[PDB]
Amino acid sequence: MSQLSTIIEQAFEDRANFTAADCPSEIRQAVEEAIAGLDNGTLRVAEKINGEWVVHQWLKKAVLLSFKLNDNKPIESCDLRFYDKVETKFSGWTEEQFKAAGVRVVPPAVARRGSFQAKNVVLMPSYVNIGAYVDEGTMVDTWATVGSCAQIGKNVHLSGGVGIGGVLEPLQANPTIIEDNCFIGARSEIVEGVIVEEGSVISMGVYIGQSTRIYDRETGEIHYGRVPAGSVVVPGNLPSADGKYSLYAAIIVKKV
Amino acid sequence: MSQLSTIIEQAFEDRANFTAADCPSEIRQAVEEAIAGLDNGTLRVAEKINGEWVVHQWLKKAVLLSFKLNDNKPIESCDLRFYDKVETKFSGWTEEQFKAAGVRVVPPAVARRGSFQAKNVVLMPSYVNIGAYVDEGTMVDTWATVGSCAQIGKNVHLSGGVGIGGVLEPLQANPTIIEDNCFIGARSEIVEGVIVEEGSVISMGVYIGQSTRIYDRETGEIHYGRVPAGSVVVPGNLPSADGKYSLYAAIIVKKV
Amino acid sequence: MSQLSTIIEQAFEDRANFTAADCPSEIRQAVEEAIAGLDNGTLRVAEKINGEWVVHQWLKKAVLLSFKLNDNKPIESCDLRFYDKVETKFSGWTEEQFKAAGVRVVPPAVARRGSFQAKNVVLMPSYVNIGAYVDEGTMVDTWATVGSCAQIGKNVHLSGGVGIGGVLEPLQANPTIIEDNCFIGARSEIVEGVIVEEGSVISMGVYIGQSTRIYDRETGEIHYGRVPAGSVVVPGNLPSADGKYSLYAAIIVKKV
Ligand SMILES: [Ca+2]
């Protein structure tokens, strides 16, 4: 026997009749124990039983009651704790070190130690993983990611939400490379060691890994792994031979 | 009468003739008051007047002058403040608790209290909302989101920018579920209680909610809400009957 | 002569024969120096030599050895440092100020000073840039971005990963505008001063800037820059005249 489910079920049906202030402590204690059990994994909102996923509605009700029963409170940075084996790049950097490096680090942007950012780089809130190199004058916009070992050239614009995929393995593969003077538009993804050559304009919504067809609409040639210099690329599709569907492709629409 | 607009207008026309160092204090004070008014909402860069949106160019000029007139300075974590009713999962976790749980929490990753992560999970900078369960060996890549009550299986790879949508209401609906051994590629989105069954490979750029057609190109069947086990899924489109447009669809291109 | 490459090469071949505990200090010192050189840019994983990008495999091996040779440790918020010229909005806000403003700021959400959030706004972990205005009751979901000067209306839902693009220059251009009662679905992007008019439903995966065709499938009209009020918009494609490819377009599929 466990009374948690029944107590939470009853309180949720009764929820219009109490508030956070006058909540009886047994309901309050039951909600806490439900939250603690969700937190240590001894309870879970849904689980697979006899081959089928089953939802436990009373645990959803516990989550909802925990919102009802707790007021907003100040939360400080000290309440965030982490645990990892790679140091962050700027811990214990002085103001002199920051000024000498010439990089703007907009909170809450983080770079890992073992990555490099040249002078006049701006890191909006974003992530730069270990082994990456970001050259002079480059803008890394909000929630962008410069993945492990990626090489970002000079005067590059990585727009918001852009992901530059990391490459460690295989050891012989080139990392993902964005050459000088490229524009990568919002929520685009360049991964798996693809190279975008110099002076290209990649619009928003463009996904390119090693399997993406890069269709030059002027020549008809399908390229892989490399955007030729000066390409303007937008998202598109290529038709199937039967005409019943089409598949995503990156379309080179002009060469500038 | 307010002189803010005129002072900011004049200073911006005159901006090549002063710097942050020798800026006269009246310009400096006007810029500050403009920023304070934008911050408390008594001023706004654009507003709807007589049914039309109007831009206030002098407030854009104030924002630009605030960049010119202030140097970069160290900003610490203590300068970030929050305000919410749900505790974060790891506040006051000891090193012993971190080691016992076996989860790597890469800064600045945050999970809410009332979510669970099994041993050998790696949280790159990412978010795990309340009620979610992330099973053993799973990787949550940078700027991914595990939404409320979602169930992530064992040895799952959530790539960068992947969103697993939360499900609280309706109470009877299954949460979004990623079964064991799935790969979800970058900037893909699995939402609204969709289940991705075991061993599937979802490429980057795949969006699946309850309204997304999942087209099995081999059988011609259109599925909803569920990716069958072992599916390889990529973004595509399906043509309209008139052939004038096509609509986004997730394409099952092979079964592995 | 430098022995770093040889030491790292040898240790990596020998890696199954030592651990972090009993690693000889020369290997440990070589790995550290490799990491320091990657961090200050004097070493880089790949570089362009005689017109071709070359990978330095021993630097990848150094990165991998740095994982092997260091255990996870607690990392605190104090180890994150930033450097920027714009203050964050809430630093030194009291509990009274937070309660009076009526905005939930879910860690690690950050807004810049000079942006406004009305009562009953919820900022999930997200970013609100300077000059933006977020009206009453609006939800900004996880890893969304409200860009500079953007105007978000009342009772708007910005879903996870949504980017609302910033607009400062040109001075005369309207910022990006989301009117009252709009739903913007996950990982969608509204940029470049586009306006989404009141009561529209934008599905996930919708990208709209000034160059995106907004195709009204009922009338056949192609709109730019503006989503008419009450539109339901989903991602699609429009066919080329030769039928060899199609290009991304936002499809108005009904008017509600
Ligand atoms: Ca602190």
Element holding A10 (H helix, E strand): helix A4-13
**CB–CB contact C73 A83 (8 Å):** yes
Q: Rounded to an integer, what distance in angstroms lies between the CA atom of residue B177 and that of residue A53?
A: 9
Residue of B nearest to A238 (CA): B236
C202: chain B residues, CB-CB within 8 Å:
none
| Distance (Å) from CA B33 to ligand 1 centroid | 30
Answer for the pair A153, A178: CB distance below 8 angstroms, yes or no.
yes
Nearest Cα neighbor of A114 from A85, A140, A137 is A85
Nearest to A45 among B74, B86, B149 (CB): B149
- Which positions ≥6 away from B95 have C-beta within 8 Å? A83, C73, C74
Nearest to A72 among C104, C147, C209 (CB): C104
C242: chain B residues, CB-CB within 8 Å:
none
Residue of B nearest to A129 (CA): B142
- Helix, strand or coil for residue C181? coil
C189 is catalytic: yes
Instruction: Label residues A87-115 b or e (16+ Cβ within 10 Å = b).
Output: bbbbeebeeeebeebebbbbbbbbbbbbb
Answer for the pair A188, A204: CB distance below 8 angstroms, yes or no.
yes
Pick among B73, B82, B169 to test the A interface (most A CBs inside 10 A)? B82
Which residues of B are documented as binding site for substrate?
104, 141
Distance of CA B6 to the CA centre of its chain: 39
Cα angle C56, C41, C24; round to 5 = 65
**CB–CB contact C44 A130 (8 Å):** no
Residue in the structure block whose two tokens are 């949280």:
B123
Which residues of A are documented as binding site for substrate?
104, 141
Tokens read off for C106 = 């879910």
| Distance (Å) from CA A77 to ligand 1 centroid | 6
Q: Pairing relation of β-strands C81-84 and B126-128?
A: unpaired
Residue of B nearest to A205 (CA): B205
Least Cα separation, residue A120 to chain C (angstroms): 12
Q: Rounded to an integer, what distance in angstroms lies between the CA atom of residue A201 and that of residue A254?
A: 10
Nearest to A46 among B74, B149, B235 (CB): B149
**CB–CB contact C39 A79 (8 Å):** no
Q: Pairing relation of β-strands C81-84 and C116-117?
A: unpaired
Note the maximum CA span of chain C.
74
- Helix, strand or coil for residue B164? strand
Answer for the pair A210, A252: CB distance below 8 angstroms, yes or no.
no
**CB–CB contact B211 C195 (8 Å):** no
C195: chain B residues, CB-CB within 8 Å:
53
Own/partner pairs, A211-215, CB within 8 angstroms, 24+ separation: A211/B203, A212/A248, A212/A249, A212/A250, A213/A238, A213/A247, A213/A249, A213/A250, A214/A249, A214/A250, A214/A252, A215/A249, A215/A250, A215/A251, A215/A252, A215/C245
Answer for the pair C227, C214: CB distance below 8 angstroms, yes or no.
yes
Least Cα separation, residue C136 to chain B (angstroms): 12
Least Cα separation, residue C180 to chain A (angstroms): 24
Least Cα separation, residue C87 to chain B (angstroms): 8
Q: Rounded to an integer, what distance in angstroms lies between the CA atom of residue B147 and that of residue B165?
A: 5
Neighbouring CB atoms inside 10 A of C60's CB total 25
Nearest to B81 among A59, A74, A129 (CB): A74
Give domain limits for chain C.
Answer: 1-69, 86-255
Marked catalytic residue, from C166, C185, C193, C199: C166
| Distance (Å) from CA C117 to ligand 1 centroid | 25
**CB–CB contact C125 B127 (8 Å):** yes
B166 is catalytic: yes
Least Cα separation, residue C2 to chain B (angstroms): 33
Instruction: Label residues C150-172 b or e (16+ Cβ within 10 Å = b).
Output: bbbbbebbbbbbbbbbbbbeeee
Q: Is the N-terminal amide bond of B170 cis, ω within 30° of 0? A: yes
B209: chain C residues, CB-CB within 8 Å:
204
Residue in the structure block whose two tokens are 């703007």:
A104
Answer for the pair C121, C103: CB distance below 8 angstroms, yes or no.
yes
Pick among C67, C70, C71, C72 to test the B interface (most B CBs inside 10 A)? C72
Nearest Cα neighbor of A208 from A219, A197, A217, A199 is A197
Nearest to C186 among B57, B189, B247 (CB): B189
Own/partner pairs, C179-185, CB within 8 angstroms, 24+ separation: C179/C153, C179/C229, C180/C135, C180/C153, C180/C154, C180/C155, C180/C156, C181/C153, C181/C154, C181/C155, C181/C156, C182/C153, C182/C156, C182/C157, C183/C156, C183/C157, C183/C159, C184/C156, C184/C157, C184/C158, C184/C159, C185/C159
Chains that touch C (3 or more CB pairs under 8 A): A, B
B108: chain A residues, CB-CB within 8 Å:
80, 82, 108, 110
Tokens read off for C241 = 């005249």
Q: Pairing relation of β-strands B195-196 and C122-123?
A: unpaired
Using what technique was this structure determined? Answer: X-ray
- Per-position DSSP letters for B183-200, written without gaps between them: EE-TT-EE-TT-EE-TT-
A175: chain C residues, CB-CB within 8 Å:
45-46, 55
**CB–CB contact A114 C35 (8 Å):** yes
**CB–CB contact B82 A72 (8 Å):** no
B64: chain C residues, CB-CB within 8 Å:
168
Marked catalytic residue, from B131, B137, B147, B189: B189
Residue in the structure block whose two tokens are 């011609």:
B220
Element holding A73 (H helix, E strand): strand A73-76
**CB–CB contact A211 B220 (8 Å):** no
